[PDB]
Design a protein around this ligand. Structure first.
Ligand SMILES: OC[C@H]1O[C@@](CO)(O[C@H]2O[C@H](CO)[C@@H](O)[C@H](O)[C@H]2O)[C@@H](O)[C@@H]1O
Ligand SMILES: OC[C@H]1O[C@@](CO)(O[C@H]2O[C@H](CO)[C@@H](O)[C@H](O)[C@H]2O)[C@@H](O)[C@@H]1O
Length: 107
């Protein structure tokens, strides 16, 4: 279960830092919500880290597939710099992000 189950039209903005969606609220209205991903996802030795910060700082080829695959998962993908300064392609499923009454939150 993620925000995606009750949201639509999810994209990244601000150069891949910002998750922006329309989230169905308590009454079933569709309201705009944005979540700064740099506040909740870090780069830990070239891996995405929930509860980290600033993953975009040197990340390259940031992209987002809101409905990736037959499982339709919200997948963020990026090349991330490891402790040795080498980059590797990485992915993280955004199901730690939830829609709470129309707002995108991190749980
Ligand atoms: O330069 C990236 C490389 O440095 C480390 C050191 O901890 O992470 C730093 O940079 C990240 C953004 O790229 C931040 O998320 C992290 O908080 C900051 O310490 C390594 O973890 C990373 O591989
Ligand atoms: O359906 C929208 C409405 O559902 C709630 C109920 O708590 O959200 C939770 O359940 C959804 C699945 O229907 C998830 O998408 C969502 O992330 C989860 O928080 C309300 O918050 C939301 O307004």
């Amino acid at each position: 279960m993620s925000y995606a189950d009750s949201s639509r039209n999810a994209v990244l903005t601000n150069g891949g830092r910002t998750l922006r969606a329309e989230c169905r609220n308590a009454d079933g209205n569709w309201v705009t919500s944005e979540l700064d991903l740099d506040t909740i996802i870090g780069n830990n030795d070239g891996h995405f880290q929930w509860g980290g910060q600033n993953f975009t700082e040197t990340a390259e080829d940031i992209r987002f597939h809101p409905k990736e695959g037959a499982a339709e998962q919200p997948i963020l993908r990026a090349r991330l710099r490891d402790c040795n300064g080498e980059f590797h392609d990485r992915d993280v499923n955004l199901n730690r992000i939830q829609n709470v009454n129309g707002r995108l939150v991190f749980q």
